[PDB]
Design a protein around this ligand. Structure first.
Ligand SMILES: [Cu+2]
Length: 229
């Protein structure tokens, strides 16, 4: 239960919900065929388009509710520690990030923080450790113009049952300058890129003692592999 609700650009705070298509509630999406999978449930919208350079260091801030912790000493802020799982980021080229319809876009993955088996650290663990922030660089080679930046948390604490993995997503509206001439060799659809039977979605992450360490085994995030320039 958390909402991607803020972007930073090379450390510069862009402001709460600025440039975002974000849900107004922290409930998860569990049907991977739903249109809610694209940018989360329909909620707040922004007319701002965040100016970025190719290669910039992007921060995506997650918190329990809109504005931060739900109450003093909220143990589930930025997100509950039980919610082990990967964090992923996608891009989709659009003409106008402010007015583009979210449906039918062509997505490619640019970054993910999944699971380190030897340290037993999930991407959500790093999210919690960074006070709700996840950090990644935009590719240096992507072309100039508007994009939708989709950042996603996949919580697997109940994912041992079909259709009970929990997805939390928002979209950031950005414009890229100083880019290159990269075009993805292939793209995926949302909904469509994920199946409920994917080994990273229908999965028992619990080991012998009941700890969510995936029994020390490597984890396969759903969707395509991140592009590289
Ligand atoms: Cu939750």
């Amino acid at each position: 239960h958390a909402i991607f609700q803020k972007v930073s650009v090379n450390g510069a705070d862009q402001g709460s919900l600025t440039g975002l298509r974000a849900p107004n509630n922290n409930n998860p999406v569990q049907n991977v065929n739903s249109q809610d999978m694209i940018c989360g449930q329909s909620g707040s919208t922004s007319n701002t388009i965040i100016e970025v350079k190719a290669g910039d260091r992007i921060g995506a801030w997650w918190q329990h509710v809109i504005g931060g912790a739900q109450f003093p000493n909220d143990p589930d802020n930025p997100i509950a520690k039980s919610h082990k799982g990967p964090v992923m980021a996608y891009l989709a080229k659009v003409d106008n990030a402010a007015t583009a319809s979210k449906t039918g876009l062509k997505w490619f993955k640019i970054w993910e923080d999944t699971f380190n088996p030897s340290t037993k650290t999930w991407g959500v663990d790093n999210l919690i450790n960074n006070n709700g922030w996840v950090y990644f660089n935009l590719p240096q080679c992507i072309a100039d113009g508007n994009y939708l930046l989709r950042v996603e948390v996949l919580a697997l604490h109940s994912a041992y049952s079909q259709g009970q993995a929990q997805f939390y997503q928002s979209c950031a509206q950005i414009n890229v300058s100083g880019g290159g001439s990269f075009t993805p060799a292939s793209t995926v659809s949302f909904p469509g890129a994920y199946s409920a039977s994917d080994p990273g979605i229908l999965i028992n992450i619990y080991g012998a003692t009941g700890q969510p360490d995936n029994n020390g085994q490597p984890y396969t995030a759903p969707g395509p592999a991140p592009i590289s320039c």
